[PDB]
Structures are given as structure tokens and as C-alpha cells.
Amino acid sequence: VRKLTFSCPCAYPLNIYHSLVFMFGPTAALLLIGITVNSTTWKLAHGFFFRVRDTRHSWKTTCVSWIEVLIQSSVAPIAWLFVVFLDGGYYRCYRSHEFCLISDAILCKNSTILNSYASTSSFNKISDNGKYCPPCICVPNPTDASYLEAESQIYAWGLLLFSGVAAFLVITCNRMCDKYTLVQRQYVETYKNVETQKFDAVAKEHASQLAEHNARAFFGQKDWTKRDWDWVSGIPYTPLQLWNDNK
Amino acid sequence: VRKLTFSCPCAYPLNIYHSLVFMFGPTAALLLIGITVNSTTWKLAHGFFFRVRDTRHSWKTTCVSWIEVLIQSSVAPIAWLFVVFLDGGYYRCYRSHEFCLISDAILCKNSTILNSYASTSSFNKISDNGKYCPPCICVPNPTDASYLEAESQIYAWGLLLFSGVAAFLVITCNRMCDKYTLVQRQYVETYKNVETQKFDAVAKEHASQLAEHNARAFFGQKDWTKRDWDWVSGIPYTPLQLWNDNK
Amino acid sequence: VRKLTFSCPCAYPLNIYHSLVFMFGPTAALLLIGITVNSTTWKLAHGFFFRVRDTRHSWKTTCVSWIEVLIQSSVAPIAWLFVVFLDGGYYRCYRSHEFCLISDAILCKNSTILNSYASTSSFNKISDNGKYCPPCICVPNPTDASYLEAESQIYAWGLLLFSGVAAFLVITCNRMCDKYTLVQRQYVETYKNVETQKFDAVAKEHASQLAEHNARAFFGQKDWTKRDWDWVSGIPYTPLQLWNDNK
Amino acid sequence: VRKLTFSCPCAYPLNIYHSLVFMFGPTAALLLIGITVNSTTWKLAHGFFFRVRDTRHSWKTTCVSWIEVLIQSSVAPIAWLFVVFLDGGYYRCYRSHEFCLISDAILCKNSTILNSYASTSSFNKISDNGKYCPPCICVPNPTDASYLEAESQIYAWGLLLFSGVAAFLVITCNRMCDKYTLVQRQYVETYKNVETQKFDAVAKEHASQLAEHNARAFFGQKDWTKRDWDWVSGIPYTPLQLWNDNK
Amino acid sequence: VRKLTFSCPCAYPLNIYHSLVFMFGPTAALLLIGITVNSTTWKLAHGFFFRVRDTRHSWKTTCVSWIEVLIQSSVAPIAWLFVVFLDGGYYRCYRSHEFCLISDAILCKNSTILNSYASTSSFNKISDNGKYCPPCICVPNPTDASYLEAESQIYAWGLLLFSGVAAFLVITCNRMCDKYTLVQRQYVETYKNVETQKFDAVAKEHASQLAEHNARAFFGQKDWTKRDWDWVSGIPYTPLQLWNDNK
Amino acid sequence: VRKLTFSCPCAYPLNIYHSLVFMFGPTAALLLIGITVNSTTWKLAHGFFFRVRDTRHSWKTTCVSWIEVLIQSSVAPIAWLFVVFLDGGYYRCYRSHEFCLISDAILCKNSTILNSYASTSSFNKISDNGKYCPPCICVPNPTDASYLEAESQIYAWGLLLFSGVAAFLVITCNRMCDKYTLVQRQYVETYKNVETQKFDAVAKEHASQLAEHNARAFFGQKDWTKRDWDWVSGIPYTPLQLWNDNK
């Protein structure tokens, strides 16, 4: 990622919650960024409450388009979940409390004053009885620190392979059940890319005709009074067009 | 941010106030910068006390435009509040006084001379009785230093997710309740961007006609006396135009 | 590779599984990337369930084309398997458990508390009886560490030579059994590269005619009602063409 | 700023004066730079003792223009006062003498020879009686060094917020009480920027006509005597014009 | 080479095999790369099983062309064998087992436990009787380490000189027995380089005529049915040409 | 400045003289550089002993022009005097002899041999009686070293403010007592800058006519004798013109 701006909390059950929201925090953030930026989302979403009913999409083409949104947007979180499992320190911090227990922990012998520092630092920092050793959760058993870190890295490659294979089979089934062959699909997608570009080129130049002629109609007039300058300004098509509608 | 130009104050209740104005200082500063720079603010604000009443906005379109100002301007402080909670040293410094109390603090045993240095360094530096240990507030219990720092980082991801989701639902409700569909909205916003640019292009060239002809009318004359050169200079349209109004 | 983002697990049979998925993980990932990117795959795959039967390929030309996919795509994993065997630390970590056994290991004398730390750290970390010494698997016998690392590097050059020779004999048999000579094959492949480029150039300009004339037919009309703007938008050729089909 | 070219003086009342002129020195310097560079100042100031009285500004438009000078020029010192309060060492050095008093200072026990070194080093360096400890003013109580430094940083954010809010309310009241709306103000300021540029363009080319024809009138003549070359040189419109006035 | 990604194996007869495949590994790899890239190889090889017999090369011109392949391709391995003998560590590692014998080795006195560690670490690591000292093979006698390293560097210059002289005599005999003189050979080779370039220029533009006219013949037609788009796609001259063959 | 190429002299009264000429040395040097480079100086100075009396300047316009020279040229030394007082080591070295006196100096107890080394090293190095301690002048009392260094930095800001304010009041009085207003002064100074440039452009091209025609008149002649080539060379308008004066 950017940097190592993290460290384990020296407590239970805060090691659970701190490590959980660092794994599944940026995935839910990158999921909503990837849905928002995706233009096929707003082809479906925009104007849904005032679209006329005979131009609505069928529910079947709604769902296959919607699945194309989720699968296109899930390349960024699974890239994040792969990185958060490779540098396995978050999985270590998630599961260190199953191993640093006060029956056999190394640092619960002389540092029992550090557990029994306050009523908070035993009871709220650990449990109702002080089950786990707090600085062991903080800095773990170095043989078990490497065991949990390496079990994390197996889970990383299991994730990237399972999501890679299932994305490969979804792509291939969307290829093989297509009604067109390859060159027909390549021509049709050539047409759609050109059509969107040429539609917006024709629209912008036609709006350039309307914007030019509206500005000349305002500045061709001499001697504007007060309410002309205020009828041009303001928040709402635009009030320049309505000013020209009365002249 | 820029750098780590900060350190905790070695006192109570100054740790409260120092940490508070570093968290909520730059948000109120970036809130007023984001309101000022935003051009939709001055479309509403400018000339409000001399606008004619039949060109005022309705209160309903005033409020939805105003909400567009606040939500566009709140991307910069919530980016700051997310950073000030990630590097959790400010939340640590805010709440260190609940934990470094003189019943059990580490450094209130030999350094009680440093609390009882003066009448100020016990009573004003801490409390009416010297409740909290001053260098413990300054440098905290290292197990509780990591507990408060990690509780801060949970609050950071809670903030970015809750503000991200609520900005996502406000955006989507402004999309789905729109009267237009997508391509009508894309054409209309194409028209408004072109219209503002072509209005200012026509205005500037028409003001270039007026500025050229006013300068030639001044320098076509020979033999200017004293009061012509002073009637051109001065603070007020412009007095060059009024000089041409008498010639 | 990128960096040395790895370390051995301090346990059995996790040294087997950790080292196995780092050797054969990125090969299965680079195999599916190399199949997907390869354009000859989608010349065969696309539209297979709706292709008419008299334009299907024969099974013989299907298989020789398919073999061209696998051999073109296997240059990237065998480059990876050569690198993972050259830096022999993964083969060392795969086979360190055959050598660090508790009959003669160096560190199973005083650190038998570290094997008998918990019920997990002997039984699940090693075996039903604690056969192997766990930190010996972690850090090995340095004379046997160099023996296994060097037996890995022999296997690397055996791999690159055997795959290089077999790719050389497959290439040469596809050269020598060709029906054409060299200059006929060079002309034919010159023709195919030009034909694909000139087919897509003619297709794109012909789709430029259709996209231009459809956009002029929409914006030549004045006074569009609501359902025209909604019939142009939407998910499906394209609904702009169908709007022109009714006008 | 540029660098840390400062250090505290080891004396009273020199810590007052040294820290005072480093805080309020560059503000008075940047105030007079910002008044001088500001062109609206010299629109009011220039030729005030020989301006004809019927082209003077009214006192009301003099004052609102003058307030525009002071508020435009006070962005640079308040940026300086914010920086001199953030790095709080100057406020520490201003108020260190209230805390390093000889009743309880740390270094007034063995180093009383260093106070009583000379008649100057006790009486002029401190006070009539030697009230304060001189090297304590120099290097302070480290718990009170952090207390004064952090009270400075609260004053910095209080300054930037109070000056930011009051500049925001002055701007908004000058917006909302404007006689024009937005687009009228945008057109008028477009006109003034063009008019100043086109006035100086017409003036410079018209002065290019006068300068060209005066130089040709000098070098078209043959055989200049001594007093022609001296009547062209000299300090004064220009004496080249007066030489042409006699020919 | 690239780097020093090597180390000796701490065993016999693995020092023989590890050093052997690092010397003669990249030569056999660079030999097959140099044969493959060489274009005169595929002038002979391509289409050999379907070339008509009256256009085959004679065996004499086959062999002199083939010798030109091997001598052009052997510049890269002999550059490698010269480098692997200059940094003489591989020849040292090849022949260290003749010198580190257990009759007089330095480290077979106290480290006889390290030979007799296991049944493998004496018998398989060395020999049927443990003839040689294993860490002596690993790190050698430093007077004999410099003797073997310097005998390697004599062999390097013997190799580069003998291959340089024999390549010089092969070149000079191919010069002096040429039927042409110099300027005739320079003109003929000028002709062959131009002829290959102008043949491929004429071929590519003539294939540009065929590819252009085939694409216009497809897109000049209106209303293609399903089987036209599938007869254009597919794996095989090309099926676009056969589609035009039926129209 | 450039660097710290200085150190105090270990003697009196050489600390006075060394520090004095480093403060007031580069000011008198930068004063004469700033007078020389200034072009208004040579408008007054040049040809003063052979200027005809009726084209002399009046003494009043001589003095106001001369004051414009001194005030324009004094920006560089006061920038130097500000820097030599900020790094206060020169003021410390100027006044260290008032404080390192042999009644109470630290190093005049054992190092009295170093004062009484020779007849020179007591009498000429210090005074008629050896009043001051020589290595104390060299390296001073560190509490008084910081007192004199900080009294210097107060004098620096007193200098930059007093010279800045007095330059501000001289500028403003030259603005407000001007006979013209702003735009008349801006036009007149536009005219003078253009007139000097166009005078020198006309002069240089007219001298290009004279230089071209004189060179053609020399090289149009054939057969130059000895004294023609010597009459062209030489120190003096120019002797080429006088050679053309006889032909």
C-alpha cells in the first residue's frame, strides 16, 4: 500500500476490531468508488423515478448489466485483500489472542503488575477475569508469530487463484454463449464507441449554435435596465434562454 | 499533512484544548475556504440586498443549491479529519488525562518535586488538588499509549465509511429523482458549460470595442489641459467613459 | 521477482504447503493470464454455442490451434519456475523437514520447552509424536542448507534446458512440415497482418458513416418530447438506431 | 520562514525586547511592502497636492478604497504572525521570565557565581536585585518549556480563525450590499481590465509616433554644432522635444 | 554476467555437477538461441518436407551454409565461457574435491561430528567411506584456492586466443578462396540487401491491393445474414477471400 | 553572504579594527558600485568641464537628481548592514573587549604565561598594562556571548525598519508633491522609455549608413600604397573618415 501506518493494539477484543476494519475497511471503500465511477451504473440509475414505463429495461437485462457492474468494480478490493493477506501482519493481529493466553504466556510472570495496573487495564483491557496476556497480544510468541504470518500467505494465494479462476469462467461463459462471433462483436463494439463519440460531437456543436445566438441576442440590444441583468443571472432551460423567450 | 509540527502539552486541561484545536482547527478553516472558492455560493450571495424581488430564487431552490455548496465543500475537512485520526497522536493527547492519574501513575513517586515545583506547577498545571500526574500526560503509559492510538484508528475508518456511504446515498437520490434521463442531462450540462464560455467570449470582445473606441477618442484629441488628465485618473462606469460623455 | 516478500513457516506440514503454493501459485496465475490475453483463444472460443455448424472448425485444426495457445502462453510460467528454482530458498523450505528430525537436530536439546510449549505447539505444529524439530525447519542445518539450495539450482538449469530443447523441436517440426517454403510463408503472413488492419479500417470508417448520419437525424429534429430522450438512452443495434427506425 | 537564525538572549529585560521585535518586526516590514506595491494606493496618493479640487474623490469613496488597501495588504503579515506563533519558541522566549525566578530555579544554586560574575552580570543582566535566574531564561524548565510552547500554538489557530472569519464577513458584506448582481459585476470588471490594457496600448503606440518623428528630425539635419548635442542631453517634456521646438 | 547468484555446494559429487551445469548450461542455451534467431537457418529449414526436389540445395552448398550458421552463432557462448573462466570460482568449485581430502584437511579434526552428523551427511554427502572433508569443499585451502583460481584464468585466455585465431583463419580462407574480388563482392552484397528490401516492399503493397479490395467487397454489400459473419471469422487463403470467392 | 570567511582576532585593539572594516568595508564598496552603475550619475557627470553654460542644469534640479542617485544606490549597503547585524558575530567581536577584562576573566589564571609569553604578547597584544585577557577576547564568556549577539539582532531590525520607513516617506512625498496625476506620469514615463530606445535605433542605423559607405570607399579603390594602410590604422572622427576626407 502507501506505507506501514499501523501497529497492533495492546488489548482484547480490540485486536479483533482493529485488524478487521483494516482488512475490510478499504474494500468497502473501494467497492463504492468502483460502483460510482462505472458509467454503466448511471445508465441504469439516472432518472429511474421519472423514466416512462415503456422505455424501462426488462429485469433480465437489468440483472446481467448489474452483474457486469459488480464484477468490473471488484478488481480493486480483491487486489487490496490480496495485499493485506500477503503482508500477513493483519491476520497475525487478528488471531494472536488465541495463542497468548495466561496459562503459559512468556510475559505474564513479572509483568502481572502491568496487567493489574488498574481496574481498566485488567478487566476492560482483557476480559472479565484477565484471560489473555496483554503485551503478548501486542508482541507475540515468535515461533507462533511466524506460524500465523505464514498461514496468512497461503490464504492470499488461495484468494487470488479462486477469484481469478471464477472470473475466468464467468468471462468464458459470456464469450461462448454470445449470439455473435468474434468479428461481428468487434464491429458492433467499434460502432458503439464511434456512435457515443459522434453523438456528443454533434450535440456539442449544435449547442454551440444555440449558445452563440443567445449571447448575440443579449449583447445586440443596447440600454439594458436593471431587471435584464438580474433575469440573466440566477439559478434555474437556463434563464438566458428565458430572457430571449420574452424578446 | 505537511510535517509533524506538534507535541503534547505537559498539563491539564491544556491537553484537551491543544488537541481539540488541532483536530477542529483546520476543518473550520478548510470549510470557509471551500465555501468561498465555490462559484455557486456567489451566484446566490452576490447583490442580494439590491436584487429585484421578482428575480429572486424561491426558498426551495435556494436550499437545494445551498446543500450542494456544503456537500461540495466538505470533501476537504473530512479528508483532514480522516488524517488526524489515522495518525492517532491527537486522540491520544485528547484522552491521556483519563489514564495518567495520581493514584497509580509511574512517575508520581520521585518526581513529586516536579509536580510541587511551584504553586503554579501543581495547581494551575493540573487541578485544585493535583489530580493527574503532569509528565504522564506528557509521555503516557506505553501499553495505554497503544490502546488509545489504536482506538483512534478504528474511529478513522468509521468516519470515512459513514461519510462515504451517506455521500453515496445523497448522490444516488439526486440521480434517481432527476426529471431527465442520462443523455438529456449530459446534453443540458454540455449546453451550460458552452453557454457560460460563449457569453463571456461575446462580452469580452464587445467590451473590447468599447475600450478601443474610448482610448482613440482620448488620444485623437490634441492639447489636453490639466483637468482632462485628472478627470481620466481617479477612483469611480469608469471616468474615461464620463470624460467621453462630455466630448 | 519483485522482492523477497517471503519467509519459511516454523512448522510441519506447513513448510510443504507454504513452499508449494509459492512455486505453483504464480504459474497457474500466469497460465490463465496468458490464455486470456492470447487472441487466438477468442478466435476459437467466441460465439461457440451459436455458431452455425457448417462454419465450425474441424477437430484437427482446432487441436493444432489449441496447442499453439498453450505453447505461446507457457513462456511466462516457465520463466517463473526458473526463477523460483534459481533462488533456491523455496526448494530448501520444501524439503527441510526430511533433515531436521528429532534424533540428531541441533536445537532440540534445550529448546524442548519450545516444542512442548503447548498442546498445539508440539502436536499440531509438528506431528502426532513431535517427530521433527520446529525451529530447525525454520532455520536449517547450514551444511544441509547449502546442499538443498544447490540441488535446487541444478534443477533450474535442467528445467530451462529441457523446455528450451522441446520448444526448439516443436518449432522446427512446425517449420519443416509446412506446405509452403519461406518466401511464400513470409508473403502470406504479410497478407494476413495487412488484411486484419485494412478490414478494421474499412469497418470503422463505414461505422463512422452510420454514426454520423444517425446523430444528424436526431438533432435535425426540433422539439423532442420526453419519450424521445428516454428512447435514446437505455441499455440494449443501439436504441439510437431504433429511434431512427421509427422516424 | 527561511531558517532558524535565532536564539534566546540570556538576560532580562532583553528576552522581552528580542522576542518582541522578531514577532512584530517582519509584520511592520511586510505591511509597508504590501501598501507600496498595491496599485490602488498610488491611484489615491499620486499628485494629491496638485490635483484640481473638482476631480478629488469624496471622503466616503476615499475611505472604502483605503480599507481595500489595508485588507489586501494584511494577508502577508498575518501569514507571518501565524508562523511565528506555530513554532512557539518566540512566545516561550517572551514569557520565560515569569517562570525562571530565583526562589526555586534549578540552576541558581551552584551557578550563583555566574549571576554574581560582575556588577553588570547581576544588576544589568537581570534586575536591581537579581530577581530572575539568567541561564534559566536562556534554557528553561523543560516541563514549563512545553507548557508555554503549547499555549503559543493555541494562540496561532485562534489568530488564523479569527482573521479568517472576519475577512470572510467583510468579503460577504461587500458582496451582498453590491448594487449589481454577479454577471453585471463580471462584465464590468471584464471591461476595466480591458480598458486599462487598451488605454496603455494606444498610449504607447501614440508615443511611438512622437518618439520616431523626433529622432528623424534630429538626424535628418546635417552638421550639428556643439550646443545642439548638449541641448539634447541633460536632465529636464524631454529636451529633445524642446530642441525640435526651436527647429 | 548479471550478478553473483551462485555459491558452492558443500558436498561431493555435487560440486562436480553444480559447477558443470553453470559452465555448460548457458552455452547450450545460447547456442540454441543463436541458431533460432539466425535467418539463414530458416532459409534452409523451412518447408523441407514439401519442397520440390529440383529446387533443393546440393549437399555441398547445404554444408557450407550450415557451417556459416554454427560459426555465426558461436560468438555468444564463447563469450560466456570466457567470462565463466575469468571469474575462476566455478573452476575452483569444479576441482576443489581433489585437494580437500581427509588425510590432511584443516577442518576434519574437530568437525568430524559435522561429517558424522547423520548417515546421509557422511555417506551420501561425501562417499562410501567419507573420503573428502565436506566444509573444505565448501570453503577451501586459501593457498590452493588461489592456485586453482589462477589456473582458471590461464585457461580463459587460452580459450579466447584459440577461438579467435581459428575464427580468423576460417574468415581469411573464406576471403582468399572467393571467386570474386572485393569490389565485385561489395556490389553483389549491395544488390542482395536491396533486393530483399524491394521484394518485400513490392509484396506488401501488392497485398495492400488485395486486402483493400476484399474489405470493400464485404462492406459494399448491405444486409449480411448470420452465416456471412461466421464465414468471415474462423481459423483457416484466409476465409475472407473464400467469402469473396462465392460472391 | 558568500560564506563564513572570518574569525575574531585574539587581541586588542585589533578586535575593534577587524570587526569595523568587515561591517563598513563592503558598504563603502557597494556604495561606489551603485553610484557608478547608475545611469543618472553619468547624465550629470559626463562632459561637465566642457558643457556650454546655457545648457547646464540648475542647482535645484542638480540636487534632487543627485538625491535620487544616493537613495537608489543605498539599497545594496543597507541590505549588507542588515545581514552583518543579523549574524551578530561581528558586533560581538566589536564589543567583546568591554567584558573580557583581567579582574574577573575565566582564562587569566593559568594562562597568564600566554599573556606574558613575550614583550609583544602582553604589551602590543593588549595594552600598556595588559588590561584585557587576550583569549577571552578571542573566545568570550558564553553568557555574555549570547547577550551581545542578541543585542546585535535588535539593532538589525531597528535598522531595516528605520531605513524602510524613511524610504517610504521620501517616496510618498515625491509622489504626493508631483505636478502630474498618475495616468499623466504613466504616459510621460512611457514616452521617455520609448524615446531613448527609438533615438538609439535611429542613431545606430544612421551610423550604419556612414560605416557602410566608408568601407566601400576604401575597398572600391585598387592599389593602396603603404601610407594608406597606415592612415587607416591608428588611434584618434576615426582615421578611416579622415582618409575618406582626402579622397
Next chain:
Amino acid sequence: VRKLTFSCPCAYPLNIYHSLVFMFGPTAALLLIGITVNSTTWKLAHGFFFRVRDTRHSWKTTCVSWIEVLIQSSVAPIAWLFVVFLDGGYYRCYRSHEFCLISDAILCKNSTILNSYASTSSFNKISDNGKYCPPCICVPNPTDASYLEAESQIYAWGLLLFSGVAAFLVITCNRMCDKYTLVQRQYVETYKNVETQKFDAVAKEHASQLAEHNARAFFGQKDWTKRDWDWVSGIPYTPLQLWNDNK
């Protein structure tokens, strides 16, 4: 300068001579470089023994031109003498022998063997009696080392000021006693710079006519014999011109 490629000699009177030729060595070298490069020198010097007497300069204009040579060329040595006096180590090395005398030197007590090493190392290294201590001249009394080094730096600023003032008064007297005013002098020097450039432009193109026509006259001829090619070559206008003189 370039670097510190110097060190004192450990002897008398070699400290005198070594330091003297490093101060006054590069001044006499830079004096003769500055005389040679100066073009006004060779306007006077060139051809002085064969110039005809009626084109000689008068002795008065010879001397004022010659003074212009010396004063223009003395900017480089006085820049050197200023640098050799600022880094005062050469003046220290010049005058260290007046202070390191054997009556009171520090190192003439145990190191009297190093003075009395040989007959040379006392008598030739120092004096007829061994007056001065040789390693004291080499490394001096550190209080007197700083006294002589600082007396050097006073002499540096005395040199740059006295030469700067006297160059200022020589310049100003050459300005004020000029027969012309400023603009006449600026025109005349504009003419001389143009005249030298246009004389050499006319000369070079006229010599281009002569060189072109001489080369065509040589190569227009066919069949040159031996003595034509030798009459063109050779050392002498040029022998190509004399070859054309006979044809």
C-alpha cells in the same frame, strides 16, 4: 582560487620566498595575460618599426592610450591580491619568522635534536646560529597565528577600497574632462563599434571575391605539370596569387 595547493616551508628564509612568489607570482602572470589579450595594445604595438613617421601617434595620445591598457589590465591581479590577503595564510607564512624565535618558542625544548639533526638542518635551515625554531615557523603559536591572519584581512579591505576609490576617481576625471557630452559620446562609440564590424565585413567579402577567382583560375586549367603543384604549395601575397601572376 582553484584549491588549497599550498603549505608553509619548515625553514627560514624559505618562508619569505615561498610566500612571496605565491602572492606576487600570479599577479605578474595575470598582468602579462591582460596586456597581451587587450586589443588596444596591438593597435599601438603592431608594425612600430616600419610605420611611416607621419602616421605615428603623438607621445601624448600614446601615453593616455597606454594608461588605458594598464588600468584595464589591472582588474585581474588586484582581484587576486585581494583573495590572497583574505585567506590570510600567506601573510601568516610571510611573517611567522618574526615570532617563532628561539628564546621563548614552545617546541625548541625537546625538539632541539630536530634542529641539530644535521649541519644543514640547523645552519642552512635556519641561520648562522640557529636563531628561529624551524617547526614553529612550520606550525605557529596559535594566538599569534590568529593575530597575523587577522592583520592580513584588514590589509585586504584596505587594498580593495584604495584601488576601488582611485579607479573611481580616474574614471570620473576621464568623464568630466571629456569634450563631448553623454549622448555625443554614446553616438560616437556606437559608430566605432559599427565601423569596425562593417569594415571587416566588407574586407572579408572582397577577399572572398579574390579567393574564389584565384581557385577557379587554377582548376580551370587542365594538365598541370610538377612545378605548378609545387609553386602553389610552400611558405611565402600567397604563392597561389603569384602562380596566377604568371598566367
Next chain:
Amino acid sequence: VRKLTFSCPCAYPLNIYHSLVFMFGPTAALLLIGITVNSTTWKLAHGFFFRVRDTRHSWKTTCVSWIEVLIQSSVAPIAWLFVVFLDGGYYRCYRSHEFCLISDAILCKNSTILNSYASTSSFNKISDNGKYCPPCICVPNPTDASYLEAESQIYAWGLLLFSGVAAFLVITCNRMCDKYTLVQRQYVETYKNVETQKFDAVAKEHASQLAEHNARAFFGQKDWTKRDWDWVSGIPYTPLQLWNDNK
């Protein structure tokens, strides 16, 4: 120079010879480089044994041209001799044997075994009797090491000044005894530089006519036999011209 690739020899009389050929080695090398590169050398030297006698130079103009060669070429060795005397280590190494004699040397007391190591290391390394101490010649008396090094640097400035003055007087006598003045010499040297350039431009284009027409005469012919291609090749004007001489 380039680097310090030198060290003294630990012997006599090898310190004489090693230091001598490093001082006077690169001067004789740079003398012969400067004679060879100099083009005036080959204007005299080339073809001297077959030049016809009536186009030989006179002995007087031979010698003054030859002196111009030696003085132009001696700028590079005297720059070297100045550098080899400035870093005085070579003069130290030349004359160290006069000072490190075995009567009083420091290291001939215990290291007399190192002189009497072998029959060579006393007799051949030093002298017939072992006069001088060998490691003293190697590393010298540090007071006499600085004496000889500084006597070298006096000789460096004596060399650069004496060669600079004598080159200045040779230049000035060649200026003042010239038959021409300055502007005649500047025109004549302008002519010679143009004449050499225009002679070679006319020669190269005329040889371009001959080379073009000879190549067309060879390739205009069809059907060249064997001996035509061999008569064009070969070592000799050129045999292409002689081939055209028979056709």
C-alpha cells in the same frame, strides 16, 4: 594530471631515474605530438626529397617558420612541467637521497636487518657500501620532506614566469618588426583563411565531377567480364581512372 598513479622507489639510484622519467617523459611525448599535429610542419616537410629546387624555401624563411613550430608546440610540455613541479612530490623523490644518509637517518637503527636482508638489498638497492638508508628514501624526514616540496614550488613559478616573459618578448618582437600595420595584417590573414577554404571547396567539387563521371562510365557498360572487376579493385591515379583510360 589524470590521477596520482605514482609512488617513490625504495632505493638508490632508482629514485633518480624514476622521478626523472616522470618529469621529462611526458614533455618529450607532448613535444612530438605537438610537432606532428602542427600543420606548418607538414607544409615544410612534405615532399622534400622530390620538390623541384626553384620552389624550395630559402633557409632564412625555413628557420623562422621552424621556430614558429617549436614555440607553438611548447605550450603543452611547459604546462606539464609546471604541474609536475607544483605537486612537488617528484622533486622530493629526485633529491631525497641527499638527505636520508646512514650517519643520522631515523630508521637505520633497528631496520639494519632490512638493509642487510640480502646481498641485493644492501649493495644493489643502495650502493657499494650501503651509504643511504633505503626506507628513508622511501618515506623521508618530515621536516626535510616539507623543505624539498616547498623548494619545488618556488621552481614552478620561476618556470612559468620565465617562459611567460620570454614568450611575451618573442611575440612582441614579431609584432613590432612586422612590415605591415595591424589592419593590413588583419586583412591579409583574413585572405589566407578564406583562400585555403575556397581552394579546397573548388578542389572537392571539381573532384566530384571527375568521380561522378568515372562511376557512370563504369556502370553504363553492360556485361563486365572477370578482368574488368579486378582492374577496378586493387592498390595503386586510381585504377578506376586507368580502366576508363582504356575505354
